[PDB]
Design a protein around this ligand. Structure first.
Ligand SMILES: CCCCCCCC/C=C\CCCCCCCC(=O)OC[C@H](COP(=O)(O)OCC[N+](C)(C)C)OC(=O)CCCCCCC/C=C\CCCCCCCC
Ligand SMILES: CCCCCCCC/C=C\CCCCCCCC(=O)OC[C@H](COP(=O)(O)OCC[N+](C)(C)C)OC(=O)CCCCCCC/C=C\CCCCCCCC
Ligand SMILES: CCCCCCCC/C=C\CCCCCCCC(=O)OC[C@H](COP(=O)(O)OCC[N+](C)(C)C)OC(=O)CCCCCCC/C=C\CCCCCCCC
Ligand SMILES: CCCCCCCC/C=C\CCCCCCCC(=O)OC[C@H](COP(=O)(O)OCC[N+](C)(C)C)OC(=O)CCCCCCC/C=C\CCCCCCCC
Ligand SMILES: Nc1ncnc2c1ncn2[C@@H]1O[C@H](COP(=O)(O)OP(=O)(O)OP(=O)(O)O)[C@@H](O)[C@H]1O
Ligand SMILES: Nc1ncnc2c1ncn2[C@@H]1O[C@H](COP(=O)(O)OP(=O)(O)OP(=O)(O)O)[C@@H](O)[C@H]1O
Ligand SMILES: CCC(C)(C)C(=O)O[C@H]1C[C@@H](C)C=C2C=C[C@H](C)[C@H](CC[C@@H]3C[C@@H](O)CC(=O)O3)[C@H]21
Ligand SMILES: CCC(C)(C)C(=O)O[C@H]1C[C@@H](C)C=C2C=C[C@H](C)[C@H](CC[C@@H]3C[C@@H](O)CC(=O)O3)[C@H]21
Ligand SMILES: CCC(C)(C)C(=O)O[C@H]1C[C@@H](C)C=C2C=C[C@H](C)[C@H](CC[C@@H]3C[C@@H](O)CC(=O)O3)[C@H]21
Ligand SMILES: Cn1c(=O)c2c(ncn2C)n(C)c1=O
Ligand SMILES: [Ca+2]
Ligand SMILES: [Zn+2]
Ligand SMILES: [Zn+2]
Lengths: 505, 48, 146, 48
């Protein structure tokens, strides 16, 4: 929860607007409450016994999801260390033989054991993710969909944009019997019907949301408790195929799940050829935090880097055109005078030669083409080579390096800005420290005892847990504002000390 | 009470009620209310 | 003091005391703080470079073994990628130090059925190992200064 | 320097009224005061 809080604070301070700050804060509180419920559920203490064991096993996997990921990383490193001993031969230990060359004779069985263990651990990581993180993904998707239905009439008054793939896919879940499965609000359909029913048609809304108007009054009329046995037939009857399809689409579109799935696929391939296990070494980027931060420097300006490489390609093409039209005689790469090897007698070969050799050469294409001294075009050739060296080797590569350096600087600036904002301003009311520090340790007192965001989260939890008939006046006021999604109760630019400055003085 | 009863009219004319502040001949800041035309708003919102 | 005593055993151990300038001179200490400020990031970057070079070594060992002959004598070839350990050492020792990457030091691919594969191999090695990772190191140092 | 220019423009627009020049700090004494001021009181689009 602390890591989630830090990530949320960073996101709000960097990519956030003061107008939506409180909306995002309340959304974070909702997500944190759901995550707390998941953590409590997985916390440690024939069909019935099997269910008990299955639940315990899944809870164990969810609890040790990260330990399993680290174990997978370790197993990949061990497998690759073993692979370092591979050798190739033309005879068994014209087709070639690959075999480990080690004295002990134990590495190969160790390799088999480690490969099997790695595949098993990858599978367990997928299961642990599906049990620990997917619930929050579905919760967020359902919450967003419900809000867009009730307060925006997304599929009633408006429509998706024909390119909002998420909006188009969410159309599959609207009429499912179990749409709000993770999101807490189980009456979103009733609320939407009551809100947009009259202007859009109650029957039309009921068809859109898959509601049975007639029976929905009966439900309120009396209490019906069914008696479903553990029968697999009953479980099949309970399965909601359309909702399951929508959920699987969401999951298979989620990035982390796809990453883990491709990890598992790569392990299975490693069983086919052990060298496929090398792909799992790239896992360090996702695993280690320091490496992830370092790689963010490259990926921050990735679009600019790709565009720079494209510009380099275009410039090299222009140089290739000039060479192909004027300097063809200098591109002979064969010492044998009998059989010349001209590298610029056709544009494709000349372009490949330039891009492959001149770009990698320390001094450009002049290092690798014939010396121009004594030729009628000597000055033209030296200008050609010098300009190639200065534009392609000195400047464009300098552009790439400068992009990386600027990425480093900008990321550090973002971190410093977040730190300074948190240390010089209240996250809730926005008043600066300077005002509060007129009293000794005033800012610290204010942010720890008066406007603590943790205290606001705790208040939301307390309101949810308390009975409504027991709410005080202020609790009822805040509860009504929460239900209406009005964030006016949050103090903005004001505080108790400001309100009672003279009385408190 | 009148504003609550006129909520619908105010909501309907919201996009066309232009509001600015000027330093008037009184040496005081004054609020000025005027009409914004639909064509004017559309042209302003054109991407170019 | 131990190093001085050793210098009495062999006079060349007295060279270790030249490193004392880092602690002694203030300007040099400040300059070296630029390197040491992001030392963890520099070490992690070197590790990432090792991993990337290992991946390139795996690809070369499986596909481009014929190009890694470093012997002119046709009688006695010297293949540098007929075993993974030798290929990895060759890559990390020669390709990283080469100005243009491993393509500078392996055999020319022109005329081979895998020519385009080889040029993609060499160009990507040059751009990822020589241009970007070393640029990451230099940028870390510059950011430390700033 | 180019990144600094972009950041400076963004910060200036988000921390100060483009017309009167008063800073957000003053307006934000009222809830969402700066946003209200720059959308409904001193909107440069409204001046156009
Ligand atoms: C997607 C970009 C590349 C991803 C890396 C690997 C490709 C994985 C993915 C997808 C397409 C595969 C579909 C075909 C599957 C069959 C595999 C295959 O066709 O098997 C050919 C050779 C292995 O030979 P074999 O079948 O005779 O084995 C002995 C088995 N018997 C004796 C029974 C014949 O395949 C080999 O060479 C395996 C070892 C060398 C290949 C490089 C893998 C590890 C090296 C570096 C890390 C991965 C590269 C990182 C790239 C990141 C940028 C995207
Ligand atoms: C932005 C980075 C990309 C730029 C790449 C180039 C930068 C560095 C370049 C070049 C310096 C060498 C200039 C080219 C050599 C000209 C030699 C010359 O002048 O000999 C007069 C020629 C010979 O006559 P011919 O009938 O036998 O050959 C033409 C008939 N054919 C083509 C069918 C054989 O007659 C003629 O073509 C008259 C001239 C034709 C029109 C001028 C076009 C020449 C090509 C490039 C000029 C721009 C580069 C200079 C700017 C440098 C700063 C970046
Ligand atoms: C800890 C990392 C390396 C530290 C540098 C030196 C090692 C010091 C430390 C510890 C372990 C030593 C334990 C064994 C002590 C015996 C020394 C030894 O076994 O003596 C072998 C040779 C000297 O030959 P000798 O005995 O025949 O002398 C003639 C004497 N008679 C004629 C009687 C035979 O030792 C030689 O080569 C001495 C001269 C060359 C060795 C380099 C020393 C100075 C060069 C550069 C600065 C130091 C390197 C900076 C590294 C910083 C990164 C950590
Ligand atoms: C992140 C930085 C690290 C990445 C390092 C690599 C980056 C630059 C790399 C490479 C371009 C060359 C691609 C590899 C050459 C493939 C040649 C080919 O395609 O000939 C089809 C082969 C020949 O069949 P065979 O049975 O005789 O040889 C397999 C049996 N054995 C291994 C036992 C001999 O059949 C097959 O293996 C079918 C293909 C096997 C599955 C694909 C795996 C190939 C290896 C790497 C692909 C990823 C690099 C491309 C991405 C570049 C952007 C970074
Ligand atoms: N409304 C606010 N509520 C809480 N902290 C605030 C608020 N406004 C500003 N801050 C500042 O945010 C920082 C919060 O400290 P911090 O997150 O380190 O505390 P913590 O509970 O020990 O958690 P952690 O150790 O996980 O970071 C402090 O500088 C506090 O002054
Ligand atoms: N006098 C002002 N008039 C308008 N915006 C102002 C003024 N002073 C400051 N601003 C700020 O300038 C920014 C204007 O927002 P912005 O230009 O993004 O709005 P827009 O109408 O949606 O246009 P666009 O999406 O094309 O940028 C807001 O941060 C607003 O607070
Ligand atoms: C085994 C270790 C991993 C990191 C999964 C891997 O192999 O990744 C690369 C490298 C190469 C060796 C082989 C690959 C095979 C197929 C896909 C494209 C995969 C990337 C996974 C995508 C992209 C991610 O960014 C997030 C996401 O959703 O899935 C890719
Ligand atoms: C007159 C003295 C020199 C030195 C030629 C001059 O002024 O510039 C040089 C050097 C540098 C300063 C700038 C230059 C860039 C482009 C032009 C074309 C020129 C090359 C002259 C061509 C090359 C051959 O065709 C022979 C010939 O006479 O014409 C060159
Ligand atoms: C079709 C025209 C070319 C030029 C091949 C193309 O499209 O891409 C090239 C150049 C560049 C743009 C991108 C590429 C990266 C990877 C692929 C595999 C490809 C190599 C093609 C392989 C090599 C040999 O096996 C021969 C063969 O036919 O297949 C290459
Ligand atoms: C606003 N809100 C919630 O945020 C909430 C809730 N139950 C759980 N959460 C998380 N209830 C009933 C609720 O009204
Ligand atoms: Ca009561
Ligand atoms: Zn406050
Ligand atoms: Zn103003």
């Amino acid at each position: 929860v602390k890591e989630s809080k830090r990530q949320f604070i960073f996101d709000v301070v960097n990519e956030g607007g003061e107008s939506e700050k409180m909306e995002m804060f309340v959304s974070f509180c909702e997500d944190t409450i759901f995550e707390m419920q998941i953590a409590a559920q997985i916390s440690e203490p024939f069909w019935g016994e099997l269910e008990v064991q299955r639940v315990k096993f899944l809870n164990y996997l969810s609890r040790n999801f990260y330990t399993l990921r680290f174990l997978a990383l370790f197993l990949a490193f061990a497998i690759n260390f073993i692979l370092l001993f591979y050798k190739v031969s033309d005879s068994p230990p014209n087709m070639v033989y690959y075999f480990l060359e080690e004295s002990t004779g134990y590495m190969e069985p160790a390799l088999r054991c480690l490969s099997l263990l790695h595949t098993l651990v990858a599978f367990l990581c997928i299961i642990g993710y599906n049990c620990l993180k997917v619930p929050l993904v579905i919760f967020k998707r359902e919450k967003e969909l419900a809000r867009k239905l009730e307060f925006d009439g997304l599929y009633i008054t408006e429509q998706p944009e024909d390119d909002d793939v998420k909006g188009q896919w969410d159309r599959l879940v609207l009429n499912t019997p179990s749409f709000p499965s993770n999101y807490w609000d189980k009456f979103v359909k009733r609320k939407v019907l009551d809100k947009h029913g009259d202007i859009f048609g109650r029957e039309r809304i009921a068809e859109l949301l898959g509601m049975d108007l007639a029976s929905l009054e009966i439900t309120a009329h009396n209490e019906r408790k069914p008696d479903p046995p553990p029968g697999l037939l009953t479980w099949i009857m309970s399965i909601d195929v359309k909702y399951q399809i929508w959920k699987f689409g969401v999951i298979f579109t989620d990035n982390s799940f796809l990453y883990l799935g491709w990890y598992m696929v790569m392990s299975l391939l490693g069983h086919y050829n052990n060298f496929f296990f090398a792909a799992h070494l790239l896992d360090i980027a996702m695993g280690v935090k320091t490496l992830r931060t370092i790689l963010s420097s490259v990926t921050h300006n990735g679009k600019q880097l790709v565009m720079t490489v494209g510009l380099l390609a275009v410039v090299v093409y222009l140089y290739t055109v000039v060479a192909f039209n004027f300097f063809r005689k200098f591109y002979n790469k064969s010492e044998d005078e009998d059989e010349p090897d001209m590298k610029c007698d056709d544009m494709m070969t000349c372009y490949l030669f330039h891009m492959y050799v001149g770009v990698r050469a320390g001094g450009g294409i002049g290092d690798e083409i014939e010396d121009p001294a004594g030729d009628e075009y000597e000055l033209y050739r030296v200008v050609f080579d010098i300009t190639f060296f200065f534009f392609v080797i000195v400047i464009l590569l300098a552009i790439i390096q400068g992009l990386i350096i600027d990425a480093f600087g900008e990321l550090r600036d973002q971190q410093e800005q977040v730190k300074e904002d948190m240390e010089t301003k209240c996250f809730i009311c926005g008043i600066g420290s300077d005002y509060f520090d007129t009293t000794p340790h005033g800012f610290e007192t204010h942010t720890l005892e008066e406007h603590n965001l943790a205290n606001y989260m705790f208040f939301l939890m307390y309101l949810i847990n308390k009975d409504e008939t027991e709410h005080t006046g202020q609790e009822s006021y805040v509860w009504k504002m929460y239900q209406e999604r009005c964030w006016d109760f949050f103090p903005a630019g004001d505080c108790f000390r400001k309100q009672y400055e003279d009385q408190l003085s | 009470n009148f504003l609550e009863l006129a909520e619908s009219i105010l909501e309907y004319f919201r996009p066309y009620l232009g509001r600015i502040e000027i330093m008037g001949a009184s040496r005081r800041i004054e609020r000025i209310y005027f009409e914004i035309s639909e064509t004017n708003r559309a042209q302003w919102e054109m991407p170019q």
